[PDB]
Design a protein around this nucleic acid. Structure first.
Ligand SMILES: [Mg+2]
Ligand SMILES: [Mg+2]
Ligand SMILES: [Mg+2]
Ligand SMILES: [Mg+2]
Ligand SMILES: [Mg+2]
Ligand SMILES: [Mg+2]
Ligand SMILES: [Mg+2]
Ligand SMILES: [Mg+2]
Ligand SMILES: [Mg+2]
Ligand SMILES: [Mg+2]
Ligand SMILES: [Mg+2]
Ligand SMILES: [Mg+2]
Ligand SMILES: [Mg+2]
Ligand SMILES: [Mg+2]
Ligand SMILES: [Mg+2]
Ligand SMILES: [Mg+2]
Ligand SMILES: [Mg+2]
Ligand SMILES: [Mg+2]
Ligand SMILES: [Mg+2]
Ligand SMILES: [Mg+2]
Ligand SMILES: [Zn+2]
Lengths: 57, 68, 221
RNA sequence: CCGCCGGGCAGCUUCCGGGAAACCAAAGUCUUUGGGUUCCGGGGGGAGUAUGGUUGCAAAGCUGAAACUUAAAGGAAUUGACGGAAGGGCACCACCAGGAGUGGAGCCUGCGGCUUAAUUUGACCAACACGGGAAACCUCACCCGGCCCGGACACGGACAGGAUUGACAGAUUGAUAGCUCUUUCUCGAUUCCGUGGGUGGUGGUGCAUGGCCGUUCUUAGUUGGUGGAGCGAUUUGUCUGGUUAAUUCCGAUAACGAACGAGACUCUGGCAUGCUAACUAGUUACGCGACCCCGGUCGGCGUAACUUCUUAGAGGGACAAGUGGCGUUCAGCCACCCGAGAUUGAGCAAUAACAGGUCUGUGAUGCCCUUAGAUGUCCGGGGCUGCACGCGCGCUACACUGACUGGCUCAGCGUGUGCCUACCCUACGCCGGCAGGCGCGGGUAACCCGUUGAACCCCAUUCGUGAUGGGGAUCGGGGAUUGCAAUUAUUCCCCAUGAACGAGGAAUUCCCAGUAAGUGCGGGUCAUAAGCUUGCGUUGAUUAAGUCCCUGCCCUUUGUACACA
């Protein structure tokens, strides 16, 4: 919130910037927004239809 | 911004000289007497002269005074 | 920056399989993308801001002013569009008016007066345009007459390339929006008039959507 | 009963079409202008007025001007605002059941008024114990007097053949201001005398401004993109209904996808015998020591374990999860178990705005002011306190549910030795009745004040319904403390004096659980210092779980001749 001087008068400027979210924290903040539930998507694995064993060693 | 009561003089220094004319007297030869009295001061024994102002007597730098 | 097209007709015209916009006018397809028009016509397509009109609704605390811009665009040979856009600041109202006018370019039929030597100069017959209350009547003229009009249908006709025309207006012509889009309506229905040299029953051509229906399967789904 | 035909009042539907639109199968087939024919309008008023004619018994009717005046009058539709219009809902800045009151009295403080040299000034739900505004001096702007220049810089004078800096006398003055008059000394190019030109103001203008706050507005409201409707202003989304504290959701759906506000959040309150740990916190044991007739007490001494109490970090915990009903069986609501909790309290808080407040917060500031005889600044004194009166915020009360005098026994917020800044919190020991004074000490603080031995409360005395031992205003005298200085008593103490006031007229403020209220203690102000304000504990209820009747708020519909609404 800073002032500008003029021949005609005085002006005021409010700059408000909403920073993007990042995990690094060097550009913006570290924490997500409190209402931003980011689910993880499931990796897709098949269900086996015959019981098999995995001997070794 | 823009002022109501404006400037007069300050408290001045000084130009019309050889003010030493009126402390010392000489003749044409080696004769040196003084008009004005010498200060008995401890900080300056014989250099500084006493005063001629406006009624009585005084000296200036150590500001020590002689009266009737 | 690049034009990734959304609609099917736009995908064809940036894949360069439509020669000119006269065939999408022929099939009367809905243009809903602005890049089509300054693809076919982007060289000479000129704009005019007819007026900046500050309308205002009245809310609880004070008066909510929104500027509404009129922009008439068109190349000087055979096409005009008239865009009307209301928005909060005048610059984005003007930019939205330009994209609406590019969207609504209508092709202009223009013909002769009397002997048919040369290149066409007037509207082919007497046409009218009405909206609001204002009636705008465009009339054929001898060559070199110029457009006789008010400055606003003057300017839309001269950027239609109707370089001579007799115009007569009735109604409340002071309202610039109705006067401009009435004039644009008359220029628009110049082609929708049925002229006696158009009685050859139409050999129907292949549609663009049908002729390039395999390209429109392959290049995007 | 089922059709058809003609014409008759109508109706519903519609992209025939038209219109400024409401709308209309005609108000359609109108610039693509012509089926036939009567009557009639030419901006609003003057005005259906005057005058003439004519009709009537009369009231009046038909015909019917002009002078003059005026920039709009008007139609349809939109959005707001408003409604003593309707339908839903909401809030103790509203009400009901109430509780404490206020208004009545004294007094404190702010305001208008009056007065005055001045009693400066800002503001009149959203001003009025507000400007952190409790002013002796300063502050201070106001008033009365007197110093200084804190005229930067540039140009030209006159100019180390010195424009007079500072100056104790003595007059003057208030002042030991050399401010100025009667010895012109010391100082030594700093500077003035004209000229421009800056600089400073708590001067004006918040109706030129920023910033900040307050308020509309503590309620749930607001806005784009593309798409639909309309010529358009606009509307749709943002909604019939249910539900929620909520534009909160289920869900409907020409809207779809989105953003802000609500929510989410952050701090605080509550729960952890599980974790982490503690000589700046403690507990328990043990050993000494003291006391009383093996035991009991000890904030007596020292240390072997531990962290329940205390400190404070990570976690955890509660989600309408579970059960029974109600409801589209959805959104959700009610009840109950389990349980430390089944709504603790705050902070932040949108779009659009008010000509709300602040130029007296600023070296944030545009413009204007006045051209030594200061609206700069400094000093001395006064005033900001003045009192026939009216008002607001409050403190003390009107006593026995009490006062007085003893005695007993309990907190939590915090704060504390300063950049200038020179003034701190204080235990302990002496003196004095008190106010205080004098010594040595601890403390930059979980260390010392401090186990913060606080009040109300509790117990035991005296009082006895009397303006009384209620009340403590006013006022005389004396003593202390801070200060350079107290008079207009700064503040505190001691004695004496003892007013109104017998529960407050109309009117009105705040509030619903550790809440109202009583009660004291910290912070700010501060050298002195709380009748204020911000916090804090302590004792702790009556009533209510509702409603739109009053005061207002939100949404929908409708009406408008309102739009500085
Ligand atoms: Mg006609
Ligand atoms: Mg007329
Ligand atoms: Mg009108
Ligand atoms: Mg309630
Ligand atoms: Mg009541
Ligand atoms: Mg009163
Ligand atoms: Mg009173
Ligand atoms: Mg005082
Ligand atoms: Mg004073
Ligand atoms: Mg003074
Ligand atoms: Mg200033
Ligand atoms: Mg203002
Ligand atoms: Mg104002
Ligand atoms: Mg003047
Ligand atoms: Mg005052
Ligand atoms: Mg008494
Ligand atoms: Mg008495
Ligand atoms: Mg009230
Ligand atoms: Mg105060
Ligand atoms: Mg009506
Ligand atoms: Zn001397």
């Amino acid at each position: 919130v800073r002032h500008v001087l003029l021949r005609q008068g005085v002006l005021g400027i409010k700059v408000k910037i909403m920073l993007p979210w990042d995990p690094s924290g060097k550009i913006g903040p570290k924490k997500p927004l409190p209402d931003h539930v980011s689910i993880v998507e499931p990796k897709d694995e098949i269900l086996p239809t015959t019981p098999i064993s995995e001997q070794k060693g | 911004k823009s002022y109501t009561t404006p400037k007069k003089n300050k408290h001045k220094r000084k130009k019309v000289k050889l003010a030493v004319l009126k402390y010392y007297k000489v003749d044409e030869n080696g004769k040196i007497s003084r008009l004005r009295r010498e200060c008995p001061s401890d900080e300056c024994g014989a250099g500084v002269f006493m005063a001629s102002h406006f009624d009585r007597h005084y000296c200036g730098k150590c500001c020590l005074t002689y009266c009737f | 920056k690049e034009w990734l097209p959304v609609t099917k007709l736009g995908r064809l015209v940036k894949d360069m399989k439509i020669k000119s916009l006269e065939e999408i006018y022929l099939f009367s397809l809905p243009i809903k993308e602005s890049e089509i028009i300054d693809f076919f016509l982007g060289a000479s397509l000129k704009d005019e801001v007819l007026k900046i009109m500050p309308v205002q609704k009245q809310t609880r605390a004070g008066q909510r002013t929104r500027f509404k811009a009129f922009v008439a665009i068109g190349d000087y040979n055979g096409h005009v569009g008239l865009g009307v856009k209301c928005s909060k600041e005048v610059a984005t109202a003007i930019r939205g008016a330009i994209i609406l006018a590019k969207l609504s370019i209508v092709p202009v039929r223009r013909g002769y007066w009397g002997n048919k030597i040369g290149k066409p100069h007037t509207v082919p017959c007497k046409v009218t345009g009405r909206c609001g209350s204002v009636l705008v009547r465009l009339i054929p003229a001898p060559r070199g007459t110029g457009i006789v009009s008010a400055p606003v249908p003057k300017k839309l006709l001269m950027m239609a390339g109707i370089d001579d025309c007799y115009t007569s207006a009735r109604g409340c012509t002071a309202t610039l929006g109705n006067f401009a889009k009435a004039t644009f309506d008359a220029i628009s229905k110049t082609y929708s008039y049925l002229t006696p040299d158009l009685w050859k029953e139409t050999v129907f051509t292949k549609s663009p959507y049908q002729e390039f229906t395999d390209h429109l399967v392959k290049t995007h789904t």
